[PDB]
Design a protein around this ligand. Structure first.
Ligand SMILES: Cc1c(CCOP(=O)([O-])[O-])sc[n+]1Cc1cnc(C(F)(F)F)nc1N
Ligand SMILES: [Mg+2]
Length: 226
């Protein structure tokens, strides 16, 4: 995955969303980079650097951690996505950036990143449509199930929005997120999502490599079965 000179294709984007691991240093009691390496070895198809909130690294320490995580992604041949921080994404030559409804406007961000991957968090039909109009390459819908990893989350919605989006004929790449585990991931794919994203199911697993591998196997099976 090098410098993109064209917008990513929907087919490729949907493949990358399969097992989308997200993590920051405050999401695990183990060594942060080691956990990311294990998740990638297991089979994660995309990784998002999300370092924020209390206890999170800041300044130069945060940047150095990001560089190491990006290097791990490079070795595994997996794209590196940065959450929120557009400047950091540009400075590190990340493969993409993910933003939410309270972050920089998608139109503004798309103009600043060229053909880099752009993901947008959406919770309603209107936000999903606005994201596509603004130039997003994929949307993250949720929370599907209860989660406490992110404190300020909107109402749990199950797979209702995913189904509604597909029912309206919208084929934009979708990844479900929020309290997803290996036991409840299938329904998300069956509803029409192109993948599942998770933090704690992998970051806090006693065996992150095995957990990522299970996700990879499971998701492939259900994408073929639906
Ligand atoms: C970070 C986050 C949640 C936490 C999930 O933690 P878990 O332990 O797996 O419940 S629930 C909603 N978000 C925002 C968010 C949504 N979707 C994505 C995507 F689209 F890139 F995936 N990235 C994000 N950063
Ligand atoms: Mg955000």
């Amino acid at each position: 995955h090098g410098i993109r000179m064209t917008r990513i294709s929907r087919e490729m984007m949907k493949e990358l969303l399969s097992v989308y691991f997200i993590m920051g240093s405050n999401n695990t009691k183990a060594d942060p980079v080691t956990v990311v390496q294990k998740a990638l070895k297991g089979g994660a198809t995309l990784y998002q650097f999300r370092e924020k909130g209390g206890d999170a690294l800041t300044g130069e320490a945060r940047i150095k951690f990001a560089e190491k995580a990006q290097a791990a992604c490079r070795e595994a041949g997996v794209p590196f996505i940065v959450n929120d921080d557009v400047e950091l994404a540009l400075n590190l030559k990340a493969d993409g950036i993910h933003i939410g409804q309270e972050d920089a406007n998608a139109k503004e961000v798309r103009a600043a990143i060229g053909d880099m991957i752009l993901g947008v968090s959406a919770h309603t039909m209107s936000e999903v449509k606005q994201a596509e109009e603004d130039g997003a390459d994929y949307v993250g819908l949720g929370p599907i199930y209860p989660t406490e990893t992110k404190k300020d989350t909107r109402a749990v919605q199950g797979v209702s929005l995913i189904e509604a989006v597909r029912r309206q004929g919208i084929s934009i790449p979708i990844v479900g997120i929020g309290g997803i585990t290996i036991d409840n991931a299938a329904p998300v794919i069956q509803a029409g999502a192109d993948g599942v994203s998770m933090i704690s199911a992998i970051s806090q697993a006693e065996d992150p490599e095995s957990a990522a591998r299970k996700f990879r196997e499971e998701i492939q099976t259900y994408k073929t079965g639906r």
